[PDB]
mmCIF file of N, CA and C in Angstrom:
data_model
loop_
_atom_site.group_PDB
_atom_site.id
_atom_site.type_symbol
_atom_site.label_atom_id
_atom_site.label_comp_id
_atom_site.label_asym_id
_atom_site.label_seq_id
_atom_site.Cartn_x
_atom_site.Cartn_y
_atom_site.Cartn_z
ATOM 1 N N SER A 193 -54.960 -218.895 77.531
ATOM 2 C CA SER A 193 -56.309 -218.449 77.204
ATOM 3 C C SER A 193 -56.871 -217.563 78.312
ATOM 4 N N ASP A 194 -56.876 -216.258 78.070
ATOM 5 C CA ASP A 194 -57.388 -215.302 79.046
ATOM 6 C C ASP A 194 -58.107 -214.150 78.353
ATOM 7 N N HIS A 195 -59.220 -213.715 78.937
ATOM 8 C CA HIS A 195 -60.002 -212.620 78.375
ATOM 9 C C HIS A 195 -59.877 -211.367 79.235
ATOM 10 N N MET A 196 -59.604 -210.237 78.590
ATOM 11 C CA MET A 196 -59.460 -208.969 79.296
ATOM 12 C C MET A 196 -60.566 -207.996 78.898
ATOM 13 N N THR A 197 -60.500 -206.781 79.434
ATOM 14 C CA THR A 197 -61.496 -205.760 79.136
ATOM 15 C C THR A 197 -61.773 -205.683 77.639
ATOM 16 N N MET A 198 -63.047 -205.780 77.272
ATOM 17 C CA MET A 198 -63.445 -205.719 75.871
ATOM 18 C C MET A 198 -62.558 -204.750 75.095
ATOM 19 N N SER A 199 -61.717 -205.293 74.222
ATOM 20 C CA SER A 199 -60.813 -204.475 73.421
ATOM 21 C C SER A 199 -60.120 -205.318 72.354
ATOM 22 N N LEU A 200 -59.342 -204.658 71.503
ATOM 23 C CA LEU A 200 -58.622 -205.345 70.436
ATOM 24 C C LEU A 200 -57.182 -205.633 70.848
ATOM 25 N N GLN A 201 -56.870 -205.369 72.113
ATOM 26 C CA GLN A 201 -55.528 -205.601 72.633
ATOM 27 C C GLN A 201 -55.114 -207.057 72.443
ATOM 28 N N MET A 202 -55.973 -207.972 72.879
ATOM 29 C CA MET A 202 -55.698 -209.400 72.756
ATOM 30 C C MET A 202 -55.390 -209.771 71.309
ATOM 31 N N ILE A 203 -55.780 -208.900 70.384
ATOM 32 C CA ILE A 203 -55.544 -209.138 68.965
ATOM 33 C C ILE A 203 -54.249 -208.477 68.506
ATOM 34 N N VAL A 204 -54.221 -207.149 68.546
ATOM 35 C CA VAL A 204 -53.042 -206.396 68.137
ATOM 36 C C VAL A 204 -51.808 -206.844 68.912
ATOM 37 N N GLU A 205 -52.016 -207.260 70.157
ATOM 38 C CA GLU A 205 -50.919 -207.714 71.004
ATOM 39 C C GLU A 205 -50.159 -208.859 70.342
ATOM 40 N N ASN A 206 -50.891 -209.725 69.649
ATOM 41 C CA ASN A 206 -50.287 -210.865 68.969
ATOM 42 C C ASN A 206 -49.247 -210.404 67.953
ATOM 43 N N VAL A 207 -49.514 -209.270 67.312
ATOM 44 C CA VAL A 207 -48.600 -208.719 66.319
ATOM 45 C C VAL A 207 -47.207 -208.517 66.905
ATOM 46 N N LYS A 208 -47.147 -207.872 68.065
ATOM 47 C CA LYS A 208 -45.878 -207.614 68.733
ATOM 48 C C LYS A 208 -45.100 -208.911 68.940
ATOM 49 N N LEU A 209 -45.823 -209.994 69.199
ATOM 50 C CA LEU A 209 -45.200 -211.296 69.415
ATOM 51 C C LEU A 209 -44.635 -211.852 68.113
ATOM 52 N N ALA A 210 -45.428 -211.776 67.049
ATOM 53 C CA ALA A 210 -45.005 -212.268 65.744
ATOM 54 C C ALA A 210 -43.828 -211.459 65.207
ATOM 55 N N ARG A 211 -43.860 -210.151 65.441
ATOM 56 C CA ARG A 211 -42.798 -209.267 64.978
ATOM 57 C C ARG A 211 -41.472 -209.611 65.653
ATOM 58 N N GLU A 212 -41.548 -210.055 66.904
ATOM 59 C CA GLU A 212 -40.355 -210.417 67.659
ATOM 60 C C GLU A 212 -39.719 -211.685 67.098
ATOM 61 N N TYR A 213 -40.557 -212.591 66.606
ATOM 62 C CA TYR A 213 -40.079 -213.848 66.042
ATOM 63 C C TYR A 213 -39.382 -213.616 64.705
ATOM 64 N N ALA A 214 -39.951 -212.731 63.894
ATOM 65 C CA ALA A 214 -39.385 -212.415 62.589
ATOM 66 C C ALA A 214 -37.959 -211.891 62.721
ATOM 67 N N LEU A 215 -37.691 -211.191 63.818
ATOM 68 C CA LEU A 215 -36.365 -210.634 64.065
ATOM 69 C C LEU A 215 -35.382 -211.727 64.471
ATOM 70 N N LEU A 216 -35.746 -212.493 65.493
ATOM 71 C CA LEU A 216 -34.897 -213.576 65.978
ATOM 72 C C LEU A 216 -34.462 -214.483 64.831
ATOM 73 N N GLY A 217 -35.380 -214.738 63.904
ATOM 74 C CA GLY A 217 -35.072 -215.587 62.768
ATOM 75 C C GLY A 217 -36.235 -216.475 62.375
ATOM 76 N N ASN A 218 -37.225 -216.575 63.257
ATOM 77 C CA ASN A 218 -38.398 -217.402 62.997
ATOM 78 C C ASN A 218 -39.512 -216.579 62.355
ATOM 79 N N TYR A 219 -39.481 -216.486 61.030
ATOM 80 C CA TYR A 219 -40.486 -215.727 60.294
ATOM 81 C C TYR A 219 -41.751 -216.555 60.088
ATOM 82 N N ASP A 220 -41.570 -217.849 59.847
ATOM 83 C CA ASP A 220 -42.697 -218.751 59.635
ATOM 84 C C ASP A 220 -43.702 -218.644 60.777
ATOM 85 N N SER A 221 -43.193 -218.468 61.992
ATOM 86 C CA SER A 221 -44.046 -218.356 63.169
ATOM 87 C C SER A 221 -44.800 -217.029 63.168
ATOM 88 N N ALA A 222 -44.207 -216.018 62.543
ATOM 89 C CA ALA A 222 -44.823 -214.700 62.468
ATOM 90 C C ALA A 222 -45.986 -214.692 61.482
ATOM 91 N N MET A 223 -45.854 -215.471 60.414
ATOM 92 C CA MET A 223 -46.895 -215.553 59.396
ATOM 93 C C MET A 223 -48.188 -216.111 59.985
ATOM 94 N N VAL A 224 -48.103 -217.305 60.564
ATOM 95 C CA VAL A 224 -49.266 -217.947 61.165
ATOM 96 C C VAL A 224 -49.942 -217.025 62.173
ATOM 97 N N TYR A 225 -49.134 -216.288 62.928
ATOM 98 C CA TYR A 225 -49.655 -215.368 63.932
ATOM 99 C C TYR A 225 -50.325 -214.166 63.274
ATOM 100 N N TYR A 226 -49.613 -213.534 62.348
ATOM 101 C CA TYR A 226 -50.138 -212.369 61.645
ATOM 102 C C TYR A 226 -51.478 -212.686 60.989
ATOM 103 N N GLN A 227 -51.513 -213.771 60.223
ATOM 104 C CA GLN A 227 -52.733 -214.185 59.541
ATOM 105 C C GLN A 227 -53.891 -214.316 60.525
ATOM 106 N N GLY A 228 -53.577 -214.727 61.749
ATOM 107 C CA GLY A 228 -54.601 -214.887 62.765
ATOM 108 C C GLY A 228 -55.105 -213.558 63.294
ATOM 109 N N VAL A 229 -54.177 -212.673 63.644
ATOM 110 C CA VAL A 229 -54.534 -211.359 64.167
ATOM 111 C C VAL A 229 -55.448 -210.612 63.202
ATOM 112 N N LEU A 230 -55.027 -210.525 61.945
ATOM 113 C CA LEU A 230 -55.808 -209.837 60.923
ATOM 114 C C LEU A 230 -57.214 -210.421 60.829
ATOM 115 N N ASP A 231 -57.308 -211.743 60.919
ATOM 116 C CA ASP A 231 -58.595 -212.425 60.847
ATOM 117 C C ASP A 231 -59.469 -212.063 62.044
ATOM 118 N N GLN A 232 -58.876 -212.089 63.233
ATOM 119 C CA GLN A 232 -59.602 -211.766 64.455
ATOM 120 C C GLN A 232 -59.945 -210.282 64.508
ATOM 121 N N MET A 233 -59.083 -209.459 63.920
ATOM 122 C CA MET A 233 -59.296 -208.016 63.900
ATOM 123 C C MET A 233 -60.545 -207.662 63.099
ATOM 124 N N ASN A 234 -60.658 -208.235 61.904
ATOM 125 C CA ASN A 234 -61.804 -207.978 61.040
ATOM 126 C C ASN A 234 -63.112 -208.260 61.772
ATOM 127 N N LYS A 235 -63.182 -209.415 62.423
ATOM 128 C CA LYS A 235 -64.375 -209.805 63.166
ATOM 129 C C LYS A 235 -64.797 -208.705 64.135
ATOM 130 N N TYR A 236 -63.814 -208.017 64.706
ATOM 131 C CA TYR A 236 -64.084 -206.941 65.651
ATOM 132 C C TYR A 236 -64.676 -205.727 64.940
ATOM 133 N N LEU A 237 -63.973 -205.246 63.921
ATOM 134 C CA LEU A 237 -64.427 -204.090 63.155
ATOM 135 C C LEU A 237 -65.847 -204.303 62.639
ATOM 136 N N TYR A 238 -66.174 -205.550 62.321
ATOM 137 C CA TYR A 238 -67.499 -205.887 61.814
ATOM 138 C C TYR A 238 -68.533 -205.864 62.936
ATOM 139 N N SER A 239 -68.091 -206.197 64.145
ATOM 140 C CA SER A 239 -68.977 -206.218 65.303
ATOM 141 C C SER A 239 -69.113 -204.825 65.909
ATOM 142 N N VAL A 240 -68.653 -203.818 65.173
ATOM 143 C CA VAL A 240 -68.724 -202.437 65.636
ATOM 144 C C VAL A 240 -69.990 -201.753 65.132
ATOM 145 N N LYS A 241 -70.437 -200.737 65.863
ATOM 146 C CA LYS A 241 -71.636 -199.997 65.491
ATOM 147 C C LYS A 241 -71.291 -198.567 65.091
ATOM 148 N N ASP A 242 -70.092 -198.126 65.460
ATOM 149 C CA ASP A 242 -69.640 -196.779 65.137
ATOM 150 C C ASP A 242 -68.681 -196.797 63.950
ATOM 151 N N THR A 243 -69.039 -196.075 62.894
ATOM 152 C CA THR A 243 -68.212 -196.010 61.696
ATOM 153 C C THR A 243 -66.851 -195.397 62.000
ATOM 154 N N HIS A 244 -66.840 -194.389 62.865
ATOM 155 C CA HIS A 244 -65.601 -193.717 63.241
ATOM 156 C C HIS A 244 -64.684 -194.662 64.011
ATOM 157 N N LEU A 245 -65.282 -195.600 64.735
ATOM 158 C CA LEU A 245 -64.518 -196.565 65.518
ATOM 159 C C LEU A 245 -63.840 -197.587 64.611
ATOM 160 N N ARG A 246 -64.626 -198.212 63.741
ATOM 161 C CA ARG A 246 -64.101 -199.211 62.817
ATOM 162 C C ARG A 246 -63.290 -198.550 61.707
ATOM 163 N N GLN A 247 -63.672 -197.328 61.349
ATOM 164 C CA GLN A 247 -62.979 -196.589 60.299
ATOM 165 C C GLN A 247 -61.487 -196.487 60.599
ATOM 166 N N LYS A 248 -61.156 -196.287 61.870
ATOM 167 C CA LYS A 248 -59.765 -196.172 62.290
ATOM 168 C C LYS A 248 -59.040 -197.506 62.142
ATOM 169 N N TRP A 249 -59.653 -198.567 62.654
ATOM 170 C CA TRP A 249 -59.066 -199.900 62.577
ATOM 171 C C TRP A 249 -58.833 -200.310 61.127
ATOM 172 N N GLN A 250 -59.720 -199.867 60.242
ATOM 173 C CA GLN A 250 -59.610 -200.189 58.824
ATOM 174 C C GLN A 250 -58.284 -199.694 58.255
ATOM 175 N N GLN A 251 -57.851 -198.523 58.708
ATOM 176 C CA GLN A 251 -56.599 -197.940 58.243
ATOM 177 C C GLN A 251 -55.402 -198.694 58.813
ATOM 178 N N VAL A 252 -55.313 -198.736 60.139
ATOM 179 C CA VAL A 252 -54.218 -199.427 60.810
ATOM 180 C C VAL A 252 -54.141 -200.887 60.378
ATOM 181 N N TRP A 253 -55.301 -201.514 60.226
ATOM 182 C CA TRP A 253 -55.366 -202.912 59.816
ATOM 183 C C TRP A 253 -54.555 -203.145 58.546
ATOM 184 N N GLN A 254 -54.595 -202.176 57.637
ATOM 185 C CA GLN A 254 -53.864 -202.278 56.380
ATOM 186 C C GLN A 254 -52.361 -202.364 56.630
ATOM 187 N N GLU A 255 -51.869 -201.532 57.544
ATOM 188 C CA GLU A 255 -50.449 -201.515 57.873
ATOM 189 C C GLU A 255 -49.980 -202.893 58.330
ATOM 190 N N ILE A 256 -50.763 -203.520 59.201
ATOM 191 C CA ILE A 256 -50.428 -204.842 59.715
ATOM 192 C C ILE A 256 -50.365 -205.869 58.590
ATOM 193 N N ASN A 257 -51.280 -205.750 57.634
ATOM 194 C CA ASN A 257 -51.326 -206.667 56.502
ATOM 195 C C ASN A 257 -50.098 -206.498 55.613
ATOM 196 N N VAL A 258 -49.587 -205.273 55.546
ATOM 197 C CA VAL A 258 -48.413 -204.978 54.734
ATOM 198 C C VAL A 258 -47.147 -205.539 55.374
ATOM 199 N N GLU A 259 -46.905 -205.157 56.625
ATOM 200 C CA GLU A 259 -45.727 -205.621 57.349
ATOM 201 C C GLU A 259 -45.649 -207.146 57.339
ATOM 202 N N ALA A 260 -46.798 -207.792 57.504
ATOM 203 C CA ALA A 260 -46.861 -209.249 57.513
ATOM 204 C C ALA A 260 -46.345 -209.828 56.200
ATOM 205 N N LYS A 261 -46.536 -209.085 55.116
ATOM 206 C CA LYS A 261 -46.090 -209.525 53.799
ATOM 207 C C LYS A 261 -44.580 -209.364 53.654
ATOM 208 N N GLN A 262 -44.065 -208.225 54.108
ATOM 209 C CA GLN A 262 -42.635 -207.949 54.030
ATOM 210 C C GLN A 262 -41.828 -209.065 54.683
ATOM 211 N N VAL A 263 -42.293 -209.525 55.841
ATOM 212 C CA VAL A 263 -41.615 -210.591 56.568
ATOM 213 C C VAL A 263 -41.373 -211.800 55.671
ATOM 214 N N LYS A 264 -42.315 -212.057 54.769
ATOM 215 C CA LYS A 264 -42.204 -213.184 53.849
ATOM 216 C C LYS A 264 -41.005 -213.013 52.922
ATOM 217 N N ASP A 265 -40.699 -211.766 52.581
ATOM 218 C CA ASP A 265 -39.574 -211.468 51.703
ATOM 219 C C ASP A 265 -38.249 -211.631 52.442
ATOM 220 N N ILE A 266 -38.087 -210.881 53.527
ATOM 221 C CA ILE A 266 -36.868 -210.943 54.322
ATOM 222 C C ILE A 266 -36.531 -212.381 54.702
ATOM 223 N N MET A 267 -37.555 -213.146 55.067
ATOM 224 C CA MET A 267 -37.368 -214.540 55.451
ATOM 225 C C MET A 267 -36.961 -215.385 54.248
ATOM 226 N N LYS A 268 -37.173 -214.847 53.053
ATOM 227 C CA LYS A 268 -36.828 -215.550 51.824
ATOM 228 C C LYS A 268 -35.413 -215.199 51.375
ATOM 229 N N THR A 269 -34.571 -216.217 51.238
ATOM 230 C CA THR A 269 -33.191 -216.016 50.814
ATOM 231 C C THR A 269 -32.903 -216.752 49.511
#
């Protein structure tokens, strides 16, 4: 538990961790993580005052939601 310079790094950073697990073989661990990042990400975009700022996250956020779904398939045999 550590807080850094006001940013979404602590959030998006989690994705990189979950993505690494999906590769090794632990997809279930990636799901719980992904679901969390997306949830924490939204809270940020909502706490924004600049449309151009949140507007960007809105796009990228979608990509993360998609990849998180694919993992469910690959992990399914």
